[PDB]
């Protein structure tokens, strides 16, 4: 009833050979969002020249839970133990419980604000498990459940994309412009069946997860260098004299390999001080039936070549498609393109404060690739491949991740996709755990004039979330001891600890990395 | 439901030959602690020169129940009956019930403060039975449940130790300094599974207890003096004349004994008027890889001898390790080193007001030990042993305890420990009754700015706690009547009684002892 | 393989007073005052040792 | 071991070594141990037990 | 040698040098045979075709 | 250890040899990989704790 | 017992009372035919080893 709890606090991590189970409970707060209504959100009005986008979408009264991050499921201790004791792991399933719900009215009496509970108020809880709504979740959003278990979790508001103002507009006849505008979808969560719960009710959800592995081990040997120098190779290198070729054997310590360095792009980005085109890769969209108005009413394109339309810089900035990290097996951009978790004062350099995946010592990831030719006049020349695509006989490893990395990303729903090897370290999965949407019930109050007037309320409760992790211990024949995740290298010995104000101390002087793939060697 | 009670008031003591059962119920109050957050507590900031410590630790939002004291479980009447009718007793188990919970919001309306109950509010109750959290409980803390059953019990706030500022700091490289700082643990109770309860719920706990006995009997005969004087001993004492030894028999009333006086240290302490080094024994810690900075940034040591580091007085005071009572079988420090339960006005002497265990008449505990030698020139000389350790063939008794003594102490979790014979009278046990932690639920309220803002609430309920005591009655062949615990010797006849203001009258003129081991003789 | 971060003498809660009082010697009499909150006397004696 | 500690703990690791090439072989077949300094791999380095 | 060496602090240089494995075949169980003994081995092979 | 003399002078001295005493608790010192595993207890009538 | 002072002077003193300490092993002294067989252990809460 009203005086019975619908659950209890569940916490702690279980370790075993084949599986690890994490248990977290958070007290959460859900307010009223967006005035209980749906609104269009147009970035052209919200932005300015420093960062401009034509992004259009819908903001909703709903909010959602986000469990996607490792620091959400692992304490620094438990993350250390994962990295030290297991060669790889992946999430098998997620169980979420929402319970001990409280609905309070916010009512002002004089200057005081009084908080009384409405025992008959309800909460809307929607789970979209088949992903029929947009999936607005960017993996690096700051909306994830809090790291410390005693911190309140404010649920983020849900909003999604509709169209690009430059592409979708009223221009031309039988044009991609109108069709993008006509065909723009609208999603309202009240059109799907969902639960409504009062204080005595609770609910639960389970999600099966299929994905690739997070690999904790590193390759000490470049696959090209794994050979025995004591012996000759039968294979001979060409030597060009005049119009003929003379052959000589490769040296014992240089043996040609069948194995090609993995795909990679070393592009840092423009490095500009604005927010216009910050990513290494930007993309522009021009449907072939698109009509350019020659105004600001549409995107702008000049034809550079026959049947080629080059976007203007404003068009590139406007469509705001930013792609990164794209580096894959190239290691030069690692520090610059993977960075996160930094606030910019500009007063003090955050260069060493920022987190990035730069710390991998793996030997399958390349600085530079050189191709070698000889011209007719006898001049050898070598150039480098800065964008190197998928090619037969490539083998490589993912970059390292840390505890502040998001766990998963959603694979786009499309006909075709290539192998899912992420540069940011997420595990792409076709169906991630379904989003749990939460909304306070809309309690209307009578009004003399016609007006939308409701009762100001909010929801508080406890969310318990649990992931079962499939893991594997390592065996090695290595004689020597290996690197492990440890505090010894920290600049600041007092880290992941509390100060006298209650502040949680993380990475104040420098970013202290607790990365995967630090020490465990696998043989080629 | 909300209108049903989850228990009733349980009280009274049951006496029987082999067991005594005490039953207590208290109404308790649990507030919000520490602003619902964890904070670091550093003694260097809180203290001053009169008492300085480098003690560092964490204060928690949680609070706990403390049952450890006899006056908590025994009325003066029931304590009298234990001391008179039983030769020994020990606690077998503890049962605790928490029920009839009430959660009230504290909300200000104008100048008035209104107390309304939140029927959906919850209480967190954590039991750590395997002692995985620090066990911050000093046995003589004033935090125990109240003696009078109608007094409200305010639960104490929980806080624990992390490190010493002098030892654990950022100094040197690969030094014990950084390692102590790096390796400092942090404990958050929200990382363990625990119950959350609303007003209609209740909970219970049982703890099995294994320990040594509290002994109520005294030895009238020194084990060295138990002999029959009517007969000669065959054993002869040496008499040294020049270079030869002549032998003569021991006198009939002096017969040498095999039995050595028990271990003891007679050290009163410095007796200074400050709080710096008040105990008889102080200890200093210097890990061998410790680096002394020659500043106030670390502890300070001068090398007195080769591979010997003597701490400065400030270092001794700073690490604040105080050990007492250490006296064991030595009786001279008994009064001075066992004292407790005194408030210092300095206006009136509390010398006779203070409680201590000074009242034992037992004959196995020694004033002084003399060792006897003879030099080459024929001069006998005798010196005393002020620190006397464990030695073969020792036998002794514990000192007396009173009703204001704590029942148990926790044995440190360590590889090695010697026999558990306490100078303060507690029963050391490997696992004491697990600590019950209690916390009011954190109910957040929305705030416009980002802020941690909660609803001010508190919990009230009833705690019922029960100990089963294993006891043994005494049989004696003594002809004469024996001393018993009785009021006759009291200076103040009106004691453990109430005055017209409701004050509970205890020991105003003088400390009236109701000690164990007063009268019951055991034969050697 | 494990280490104790806490001296067994220092494991106590400073937030609260100890009932136990330290002696102060003036002339032939003893005055008592409570131990400070951060210094609480312990039952536990340092282990055996010889520094030679 | 099981711990409720929040923070990561010290572990036996090469990071503190003065000589990175240790417990390894040289070109003469010599087994390299502690030439510049004694590199300790001790017990009881990091794992806390509560009192 | 160019990558794995003793240079810098908390650098890939030292870590490659520290983390370099060493393999000794006498740390794995294996057969020892005299003149009258023999041994056999079978290996299943999965692969693509030679066309 | 702490005493006070009759004239009111507190004085403190140190215990350089400290034996087994009631209510002691301590840990062993660390070991390393070059430490011997066992030792033989002498064959005798009496022995104290093996630490 | 053997110490060395700061000025470099080694000095040795003797322990005339030596108590129970970890890792001690010893034997009882001999007896003869005129020795008593038993003694009574005092009736007390605590006693050390009976040697």
Contact G2 C48 (CB under 8 A): no
Phi, psi of A78 (to 5 degrees): -70, -30
All partners of chain A with 3 or more CB pairs under 8 angstroms: B, D, E
Question: Which secondary structure element, helix H or strand E, spans residue B302, and what is its range?
Answer: strand B301-305
Question: B59: which 2 tokens?
Answer: 């204060």
Contact D51 C11 (CB under 8 A): yes
Nearest to B424, CA basis, from B407, B439, B444, B447: B407
What 3-state DSSP class applies to A434? coil
Tally B–C CB contacts below 8 A. 180
Nearest to B60, CA basis, from B108, B128, B130: B128
Mutate to test the interface with E, among A219, A224, A359, A361 (most CBs of E within 10 A): A361
- Angstrom distances, CA of residue F36 to CA of A32, B288, F10: 68, 22, 47
Cis, bond preceding B175 (omega within 30 deg of 0): no
**Residues after which chain G has a gap (C–N > 2.5 Å):** none
| A220-233 burial: b if 16+ Cβ within 10 Å, else e | bbbbbeeeeeeeeb
Contact D10 A487 (CB under 8 A): yes
Tally A–B CB contacts below 8 A. 138
What DSSP letter does each residue of chain D carry, written as one string?
------S------GGG-S-SS-SEE-TTS-EE-SSSS-----SSSSEEE--
Contact A76 D8 (CB under 8 A): yes
Phi, psi of D36 (to 5 degrees): -80, -40
What 3-state DSSP class applies to G4? strand
All partners of chain E with 3 or more CB pairs under 8 angstroms: A, D
Collect all residues of chain B within an 8 Å Cβ-Cβ radius of residue D49: 413
Quote the CA–CA distance of A387 and G19 in Å, as a whole number: 79
Cα distance between the two ends of chain A: 62
What 3-state DSSP class applies to A180? helix
Chain F contacts to G (CB-CB under 8 A): 17, 19-20, 22, 41-42, 44-51
- CA count, 13 A, side-chain hemisphere, B185: 21
Quote the CA–CA distance of B83 and B518 in Å, as a whole number: 8
Nearest to A125, CA basis, from A62, A83, A50: A62
B381 contacts B370 by C-beta, under 8 angstroms: no
Q: Where are the alpha helices (DSSP H) in B250-402?
A: 313-319, 334-337
Contact B421 G45 (CB under 8 A): yes
**Residue in this structure with the two tokens 């790096």, named with its chain if needed:** B182
What 3-state DSSP class applies to C50? strand
Quote the CA–CA distance of E29 and E24 in Å, as a whole number: 11
Cis, bond preceding B325 (omega within 30 deg of 0): yes
Tell me how many degrees the CA angle A438-A444-A448 measures, rounded to the nearest 5.
155
- Angstrom distances, CA of residue D30 to CA of B430, D36, E14, E18, E19: 51, 15, 21, 17, 19
Phi, psi of A436 (to 5 degrees): -100, 115
Q: How far is F5 from chain G (nearest CA, A)?
A: 25
Quote the CA–CA distance of A152 and C10 in Å, as a whole number: 33
Question: B144: which 2 tokens?
Answer: 């125990």
Q: What is the resolution of this structure in A?
A: 2.5
In angstroms and rounded to an integer, the radius of gyration of the C-alpha atoms of chain A is 28
Quote the CA–CA distance of A488 and B377 in Å, as a whole number: 64
Quote the CA–CA distance of B203 and B195 in Å, as a whole number: 9
CA-nearest residue to E13 within chain A is A361
What 3-state DSSP class applies to B450? coil
Question: A228: which 2 tokens?
Answer: 């025995």
**Long-range pairs for A185-192 at CB < 8 Å and ≥24 separation?**
A186/A58, A186/A162, A187/A58, A187/A133, A187/A134, A187/A160, A188/A38, A188/A60, A189/A60, A189/A62, A189/A126, A189/A133, A189/A158, A189/A437, A189/A439, A192/A126, A192/A128, A192/A132, A192/A133
Q: How was this structure determined?
A: cryo-EM
Of F17, F22, F41, the CB nearest to G25: F41
A474 contacts A463 by C-beta, under 8 angstroms: no
**Residue in this structure with the two tokens 């102490």, named with its chain if needed:** B409
Residues paired with residue B511 on neighbouring β-strands, in sequence order: none
Residues paired with residue A39 on neighbouring β-strands, in sequence order: A59
Contact A361 E12 (CB under 8 A): yes
Quote the CA–CA distance of B423 and B336 in Å, as a whole number: 12
A21 contacts A13 by C-beta, under 8 angstroms: yes
Indicate contact of C with A: 3+ CB pairs under 8 A: no
Q: How far is B405 from chain G (nearest CA, A)?
A: 19
Instruction: List all residues 6 or more positions away from B521 whose beta carbon is below 8 Å from its beta carbon.
Output: B217, B218, B219, B220, B476, B478, B482
Indicate contact of C with E: 3+ CB pairs under 8 A: no
Of D9, D14, D23, the CB nearest to A77: D9
- Angstrom distances, CA of residue B90 to CA of A1, B218, B359, B424, B428: 43, 17, 21, 16, 12
- Angstrom distances, CA of residue B167 to CA of A496, B290, B319: 19, 8, 9
Residues paired with residue B105 on neighbouring β-strands, in sequence order: B116, B457
Q: Where are the alpha helices (DSSP H) in A27-175?
A: 43-46, 70-73, 76-85
Question: B270: which 2 tokens?
Answer: 């410095």
What DSSP letter does each residue of A295-337 carry, written as one string?
SSSS--EEEEETTEEEEPHHHHHHHTEEE----BTB-TTHHHH
Of D7, D8, D13, the CB nearest to A483: D13
Quote the CA–CA distance of G19 and G29 in Å, as a whole number: 17
A8 contacts B193 by C-beta, under 8 angstroms: yes
Residues paired with residue A116 on neighbouring β-strands, in sequence order: A105
Quote the CA–CA distance of B517 and F35 in Å, as a whole number: 51
Quote the CA–CA distance of A219 and A522 in Å, as a whole number: 5
């Amino acid at each position: 009833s009203v005086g019975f709890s619908t659950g209890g606090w569940t916490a702690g991590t279980y370790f075993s050979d084949n599986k690890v189970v994490t248990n977290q409970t958070r007290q959460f707060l859900t307010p009223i969002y967006n005035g209980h209504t749906y609104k269009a959100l147009q970035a052209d009005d919200l932005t300015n020249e420093n960062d401009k986008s034509k992004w259009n979408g819908i903001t909703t009264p709903w909010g959602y839970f986000n469990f996607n991050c490792y620091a959400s499921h692992f304490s620094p201790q438990d993350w250390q133990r994962m990295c030290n004791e297991y060669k790889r792991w992946r999430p098998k399933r997620l169980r979420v419980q929402i319970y001990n719900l409280q609905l309070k009215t916010i009512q002002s009496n004089g200057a005081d604000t009084q908080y009384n509970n409405d025992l008959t108020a309800a909460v809307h809880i929607l789970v979209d498990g088949s992903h029929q709504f947009p999936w607005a979740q960017h993996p690096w959003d700051d909306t994830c459940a809090p790291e410390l278990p005693y911190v309140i979790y404010k649920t983020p508001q849900y909003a999604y994309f509709q169209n690009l103002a430059g592409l979708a507009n009223n221009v031309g006849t039988n044009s991609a412009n109108k069709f993008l505008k006509m065909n723009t979808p609208l999603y309202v969560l009240e059109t799907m069946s969902h639960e409504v719960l009062r204080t005595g009710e609770d609910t639960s959800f389970e999600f099966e997860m299929s994905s690739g592995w997070v690999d904790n081990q590193t390759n000490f040997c470049p696959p090209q260098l794994d050979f025995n120098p004591l012996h000759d190779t039968r294979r001979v290198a060409p030597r060009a004299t005049n119009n003929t070729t003379q052959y000589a054997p490769y040296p014992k310590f240089k043996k040609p390999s069948n194995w090609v360095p993995g795909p990679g792009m070393a592009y840092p980005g423009r490095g500009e001080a604005d927010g216009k085109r910050p990513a290494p890769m930007t993309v522009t969209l021009r449907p072939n039936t698109f009509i350019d108005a020659g105004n600001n009413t549409t995107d702008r394109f000049q034809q550079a070549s026959y049947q080629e339309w080059k976007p203007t810089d404003d068009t590139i900035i406007g469509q705001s498609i930013n792609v990164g990290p794209i580096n894959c097996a190239a290691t030069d951009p690692d520090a610059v393109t993977t960075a996160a978790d930094a606030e910019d004062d500009v007063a003090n350099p955050n260069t060493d404060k920022v987190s990035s995946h730069r710390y991998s010592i793996d030997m399958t990831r390349w600085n530079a690739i050189q191709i070698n030719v000889r011209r007719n006049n006898g001049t050898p020349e070598t150039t480098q491949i800065y964008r190197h695509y998928l090619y037969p006989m490539q083998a490589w490893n993912s970059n390292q991740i840390d505890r502040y990395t998001p766990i998963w990303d959603k694979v786009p729903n499309t006909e075709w996709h290539t192998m899912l090897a992420s540069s940011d370290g997420t595990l792409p999965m076709t169906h991630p755990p379904g989003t749990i949407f939460i909304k306070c019930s809309k309690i209307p109050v009578p009004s003399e004039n016609n007006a939308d007037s409701y009762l100001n309320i909010y929801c508080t409760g406890q969310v318990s979330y649990e992931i079962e992790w499939e893991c594997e211990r390592y065996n090695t024949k290595n004689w020597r001891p290996e690197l492990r995740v440890d505090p010894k290298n920290w600049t600041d010995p007092n880290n992941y600890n509390l100060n006298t104000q209650g502040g949680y101390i993380v990475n104040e002087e420098l970013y202290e990395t607790m990365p995967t793939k630090i020490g465990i060697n696998r043989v080629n």
